Design a protein around this ligand. Sequence first.
Ligand code: HEC
Length: 108
Amino acid sequence: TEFKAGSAKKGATLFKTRCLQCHTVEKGGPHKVGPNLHGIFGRHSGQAEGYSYTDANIKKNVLWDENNMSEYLTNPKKYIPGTKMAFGGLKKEKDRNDLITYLKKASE
Ligand code: HEC
């Protein structure tokens, strides 16, 4: 959205051993370490009711889109007060730029 955009770079191989380790963009995703994302971006924070979420994320309504999301992906444990998301942060806008770039795809 605002980033320098990507180019279907190494995004797929990213999520795999980056988010997949926790999550599942798919629908069938029964949920593992984290809730399912799917075609996020546009909704208000978490979008899963069946699965028990956190009282921090849901309590944010951080309308996902592109930059925002990344804004959290980087520092999810700061922005979100009480994020069970044990990610830490990529701190590498480089990948981040590709993350969303591809994410949007994976999400769609
Ligand atoms: C495990 C070490 C994680 C990795 C790697 C990533 N995520 Fe994550 N995410 C994780 C948790 C434990 C949670 C919170 C769930 C809880 O209830 O404990 C999250 C949350 C998300 C969210 C918001 C959903 C929500 O649960 O409220 C998003 C949009 C999200 N995670 C996306 C996502 C992406 C795209 C990642 C790879 C770049 C990723 N996460 C990594 C755990 C883990």
